[PDB]
Design a protein around this motif. Structure first.
Motif, PDB file in Angstrom:
ATOM      1  N   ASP A 244       0.698  -1.624  -0.039  1.00  0.00           N
ATOM      2  CA  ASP A 244      -0.164   0.211  -0.268  1.00  0.00           C
ATOM      3  C   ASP A 244       1.166   1.561   0.172  1.00  0.00           C
ATOM      4  OD1 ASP A 244      -2.046  -1.917   0.357  1.00  0.00           O
ATOM      5  OD2 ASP A 244      -2.275  -1.368   2.073  1.00  0.00           O
ATOM      6  N   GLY A 245       2.296   1.627   0.890  1.00  0.00           N
ATOM      7  CA  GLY A 245       2.742   2.606   1.113  1.00  0.00           C
ATOM      8  C   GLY A 245       3.341   2.472  -0.133  1.00  0.00           C
ATOM      9  N   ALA A 246       4.195   1.717  -0.911  1.00  0.00           N
ATOM     10  CA  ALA A 246       4.934   1.543  -1.885  1.00  0.00           C
ATOM     11  C   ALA A 246       4.609   2.235  -3.413  1.00  0.00           C
ATOM     12  CB  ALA A 246       4.985   0.486  -2.162  1.00  0.00           C
TER      13      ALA A 246
ATOM     14  N   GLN B 109      13.653   3.028  -8.610  1.00  0.00           N
ATOM     15  CA  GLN B 109      13.811   2.374  -7.076  1.00  0.00           C
ATOM     16  C   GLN B 109      11.962   1.674  -6.687  1.00  0.00           C
ATOM     17  OE1 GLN B 109      15.265   4.965  -4.448  1.00  0.00           O
ATOM     18  NE2 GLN B 109      17.298   5.247  -5.681  1.00  0.00           N
ATOM     19  N   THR B 110      11.335   2.715  -6.303  1.00  0.00           N
ATOM     20  CA  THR B 110       9.780   2.629  -5.994  1.00  0.00           C
ATOM     21  C   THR B 110       9.138   1.676  -7.316  1.00  0.00           C
ATOM     22  OG1 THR B 110       9.727   4.971  -5.475  1.00  0.00           O
ATOM     23  CG2 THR B 110       7.616   3.846  -5.186  1.00  0.00           C
ATOM     24  N   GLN B 111       9.097   1.748  -8.462  1.00  0.00           N
ATOM     25  CA  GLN B 111       8.866   0.834  -9.104  1.00  0.00           C
ATOM     26  C   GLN B 111       9.338  -0.830  -9.306  1.00  0.00           C
ATOM     27  OE1 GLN B 111       9.821   1.979 -13.105  1.00  0.00           O
ATOM     28  NE2 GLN B 111       7.550   2.882 -13.363  1.00  0.00           N
ATOM     29  N   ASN B 112      10.392  -0.780  -8.753  1.00  0.00           N
ATOM     30  CA  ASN B 112      11.453  -2.194  -8.166  1.00  0.00           C
ATOM     31  C   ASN B 112      11.131  -2.272  -6.961  1.00  0.00           C
ATOM     32  OD1 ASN B 112      12.421  -2.521 -11.055  1.00  0.00           O
ATOM     33  ND2 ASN B 112      13.918  -1.336 -10.023  1.00  0.00           N
ATOM     34  N   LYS B 113      10.276  -1.998  -5.623  1.00  0.00           N
ATOM     35  CA  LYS B 113       9.192  -2.249  -5.189  1.00  0.00           C
ATOM     36  C   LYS B 113       8.327  -2.731  -4.870  1.00  0.00           C
ATOM     37  CE  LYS B 113       9.792  -0.658  -0.307  1.00  0.00           C
ATOM     38  NZ  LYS B 113       8.972   0.316   1.367  1.00  0.00           N
ATOM     39  N   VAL B 114       7.775  -2.223  -5.781  1.00  0.00           N
ATOM     40  CA  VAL B 114       6.088  -2.196  -5.800  1.00  0.00           C
ATOM     41  C   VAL B 114       6.325  -4.080  -6.842  1.00  0.00           C
ATOM     42  CG1 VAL B 114       4.138  -1.246  -7.093  1.00  0.00           C
ATOM     43  CG2 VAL B 114       4.872   0.253  -6.239  1.00  0.00           C
TER      44      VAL B 114
END
Ligand code: NA
Ligand code: NA
Ligand code: NA
Ligand code: NA
Lengths: 264, 251, 251, 264
Positions: C133-135, C169-174
């Motif tokens: 959710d956060g990501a 970075q965010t796309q890889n985390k999601v």
């Protein structure tokens, strides 16, 4: 603890949950009214029937042990007077049980018909949500074209401005078509969720009601077997009277177990 | 609008959720949580929505008025005024998001706890149903012997007398085991009904949180940035103000 | 007849049960168990049923022939012959009942084990969905900033360059968190489908066991007992022989 | 690991389970044939589309970094030739993606319609089982009367025998009526159970198919945003070309993440 007591308690809980639902169709209101009447009027009549069956069984259990305490021969006129008295005392309990079963089956059968009717309605919501999803898909594509033309005309010079002033009005209309269909899909999903929740509670009420009906029916069946034993004394040997009294006493004790307030 | 529907669906689930009695602590935890969400948190989401829409309508008109006027120390007297007027709404939105996630996360944990309880109740029945089957099979055998012995006339009386004693013991065993199985089945059924409602409440709460997050993200972007760029600036900002009205709409 | 239908429904569930792959040990346990039930135990239930019906039809005719004849050491030359002819069928029936209960009970235990596994998988998601959710909310914020900066013309280029790095970075985390949540959701879905089939198999197996028990009870009663009583005896026995044909019928 | 890879694998498992079901109605056979064709023909075309999107994205990622490595001014004719080459290379990938999405939505929508049709059939089985349960209830009552009359006539003397010889034939007929209705109720319960199991598998197939469609659609949306960035170079300042190349490169990297074989 007992099966009647549990079924009643569970039905009382399901009924409170069933009444908490609002905004449902007529078949849901049909069940809400029915279960309200079952909890108000029929479950007290089931508790009365239970008390009367146990009172009857306790009195007949002692009458049968007192007959079985007879030594030497059974006076055939004393037998008949007893058989007559017991047949007269079974009649009203057998009747109240049959009446209780009939009222229960009537109410429960109306729940099942309203449930089936609600299920047909839930399937028609599934059909409705699947055209709204297509209309939504297509208004999204329509909004993709419009925004690619906006890209294009924004790409032209002064020559573009007239066409852009027009497209701006089409874009608002198509956007409001998309936002409306998203709201309609959200709306029908919520209605589907609420009805499934309601049907889960009415199915549970009906399962508990069914357990009550099966036990009322079992009580009636035992009263009928008891009747048959007692009449096999009336057909008259002192050892035959003893056989049918002994058989009748097993049925009397069966009632006490089946109609029991507490299990064990 | 999704936000208004999420609120409405949350209110119905909460009434249904409060109707359940005789459930474990974890269910009571959810009942209290959802009572507070409906009493305190949803009015604040309604207040947040009113303030966002009011703020968006005022800024929309202002951005159009700027795109209409025909000054490098004017674009700063404004940007400072927006970032000022947007600060209180940015706060209410972050608080509302944090409070929503916190309440929703506790529902999720209580729900898992109730699922663990339900599987243990199912394991308890399996341990008992075996003994109940056995007792029901003996009782079947004894009911058959009773009908047979009674059919033998006086030859069956010693046999019926002996069977009457065993019948009483088996009937009491079946009654106890049935009552125990029926009690646990009743508990599982009630908890499953309750879990259906709390899962539904949480699904609606998820939609509300997502919408509150989309709003707070648009606002944060309008509140943190600073000469024909002014035109492109106002055009970008105005596209945002308009999504804000859509995301937080009453439709 | 219920027995024939139970067998047929057990065969369909077994084909569906064998179609599932990538499940834990407890599911493999059920797959092997049900394979053996269908291959070895159901043919024996079919053999038991044939022998019971054949035996019941012969004894029915014999009981009618006895009720027709117009001798205290004749009622014993018979009763001994019945108890003899009924012994092999009484054995097959007890063995079939014991083997059925043993196989069914193991399915019940494996099913509970799979329910415990499913609740733990659900607890694993709850722990991850929060982070996801956060990501997803940051990624939403970054997609919005990308569209805005690109709209600012050249003024937005330093800002877009910096955002491009964070976006990666965010796309890889999601992507990682989605993939992990999606994997566990897939496992839960497969196991729930498998549990629906194994519960159904076990429900049908319960009906078969109940019917096999009702048959073995009627047989045991005919095989353990010893002069106008002969008439009442034969009349009682004949009522039993007839229920035997009904309980074990092919209808 | 990746969302396309998972959806495909899950759909392959659901399909094997869906094929294991026999004795179902035409709408179930409709889905069995559809999912067979999806697994045989469409999932390989989805894997081809994935490979082509990644190949395209890897080539364009390096082309964009090489453009962004340009120092001093962008030669406006070199820009246009590049924009032209990229627009020509997007066209076939954007087309194959749109085609893949269309084939997916077609097949999935037919599954949803067959599912709704099977649901209507399941509700009509619920209606049918509720008349069979009443007929069964009533044939049980009919058998209770007959056995009470048998009690009575067995209770008479020689006078009873004629009436008993008659009742014996009625009792057999009523018994066969009860045994038949028990078999019919058992039969419809089994059919209901089997169809619910089948619909559980087709719903799961459709949920996984939906995850595949949403990701194919996301890939198409990113290709469209990429197209818009690239055309904003064609509309032409060397710093604007740099802005739109930088925006385009974010979309290219989005494709590589979204169409990725392995997650991370
Ligand atoms: Na009420
Ligand atoms: Na009873
Ligand atoms: Na296939
Ligand atoms: Na993408």
């Amino acid at each position: 603890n007992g099966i009647l007591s549990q079924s009643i308690a569970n039905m009382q809980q399901a009924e409170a949950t069933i009444q908490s639902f609002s905004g449902l169709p007529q078949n849901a209101v049909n069940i809400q009214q029915n279960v309200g009447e079952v909890v108000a009027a029929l479950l007290p009549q089931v508790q009365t029937m239970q008390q009367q069956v146990l009172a009857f069984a306790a009195r007949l259990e002692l009458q049968l042990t007192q007959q079985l305490a007879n030594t030497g021969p059974f006076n055939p006129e004393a037998l008949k007077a007893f058989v007559d008295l017991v047949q007269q005392e079974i009649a009203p309990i057998q009747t109240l049980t049959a009446q209780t079963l009939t009222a229960s089956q009537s109410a429960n059968d109306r729940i099942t018909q309203d449930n089936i009717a609600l299920q047909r309605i839930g399937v028609e919501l599934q059909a409705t949500i699947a055209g709204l999803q297509s209309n939504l898909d297509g208004a999204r594509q329509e909004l993709d074209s419009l925004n690619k033309k906006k890209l294009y005309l924004t790409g032209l010079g002064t020559t573009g401005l007239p066409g852009l002033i027009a497209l701006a009005v089409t874009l608002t209309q198509t956007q409001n078509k998309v936002s409306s269909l998203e709201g309609q899909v959200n709306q029908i999903e919520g209605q589907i969720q609420r009805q499934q929740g309601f049907l889960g509670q009415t199915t549970a009420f009906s399962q508990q009601f069914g357990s009550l009906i099966d036990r009322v029916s079992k009580v009636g069946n035992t009263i009928s077997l008891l009747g048959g034993d007692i009449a096999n004394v009336a057909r008259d040997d002192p050892e035959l009277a003893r056989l049918f009294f002994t058989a009748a006493l097993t049925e009397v004790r069966t009632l006490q177990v089946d109609a029991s307030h507490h299990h064990h």
